[PDB]
Amino acid sequence: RPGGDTIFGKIIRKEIPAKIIFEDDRCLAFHDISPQAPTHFLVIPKKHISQISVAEDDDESLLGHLMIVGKKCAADLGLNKGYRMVVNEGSDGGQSVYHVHLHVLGGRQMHWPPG
Amino acid sequence: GDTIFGKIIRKEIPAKIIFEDDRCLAFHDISPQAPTHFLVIPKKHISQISVAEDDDESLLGHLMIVGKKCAADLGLNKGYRMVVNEGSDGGQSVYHVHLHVLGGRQMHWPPG
Numbered sequence A: 001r002p003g004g005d006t007i008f009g010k011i012i013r014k015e016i017p018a019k020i021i022f023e024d025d026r027c028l029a030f031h032d033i034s035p036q037a038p039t040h041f042l043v044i045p046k047k048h049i050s051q052i053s054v055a056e057d058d059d060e061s062l063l064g065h066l067m068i069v070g071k072k073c074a075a076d077l078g079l080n081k082g083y084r085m086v087v088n089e090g091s092d093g094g095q096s097v098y099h100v101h102l103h104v105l106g107g108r109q110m111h112w113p114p115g
Numbered sequence B: 001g002d003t004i005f006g007k008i009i010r011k012e013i014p015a016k017i018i019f020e021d022d023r024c025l026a027f028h029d030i031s032p033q034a035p036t037h038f039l040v041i042p043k044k045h046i047s048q049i050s051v052a053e054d055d056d057e058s059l060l061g062h063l064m065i066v067g068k069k070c071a072a073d074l075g076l077n078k079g080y081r082m083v084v085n086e087g088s089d090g091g092q093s094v095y096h097v098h099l100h101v102l103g104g105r106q107m108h109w110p111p112g
């Protein structure tokens, strides 16, 4: 099955439901099931990449596309005071789903340090 | 307008530079929030991610690829967190878009 069998691969194939914000041929944006801010969503590639540490050089455009889609979705969601984008890599990064994804959090003041 | 990151790019003030190419610069954060905390910034003066253009897509991804290579070179084999802040709610401290890379400790949840 294209995309693998992590939770995110199954969401991509519409096998498990999600609250989808935006979808194109390269990525999917959907709300996080455990939001850490009043608005908290994810932008993920449809191509399965386990983690940023194994991304290829030719994945540059795709990774940038996650950020462009993330900022567009944030504007569409009315996050006019700003937001924070986060990638969690590995154990120290707090990663729990090994399919690359960008968090976008807003709707409140975010604090420093970022965890 | 110009920012302190513009001065760093132009080598007018010092920073602990990790990596440079023709389109970005990576350097340690002067106020580190983790044992390793560095920034990857484009040389193009994009003020904030909310105004990035579609043509900037591969450049933004280049910041992340450079970030993950610098992280490996700095020994962050247990992982790290990448952060881009936008605006006042995002806590953006400098209006020149920059990717934070933090590691060398457990990063926590929520991410601020």
Ligand SMILES: Nc1nc2c(ncn2[C@@H]2O[C@H](COP(=O)(O)O)[C@@H](O)[C@H]2O)c(=O)[nH]1
Residues within 6 Å of the ligand: A007, A018, A019, A030, A031, A032, A033, A034, A035, A087, A088, A094, A095, A096, A097, A098, A101
């Ligand atoms: N929408 C949705 N989000 C999920 C599901 N399972 C896990 N998540 C979210 O995916 C994120 C994984 O990010 P990580 O912890 O790997 O950085 C977490 O914020 C978690 O709440 C799910 O079934 N549906």
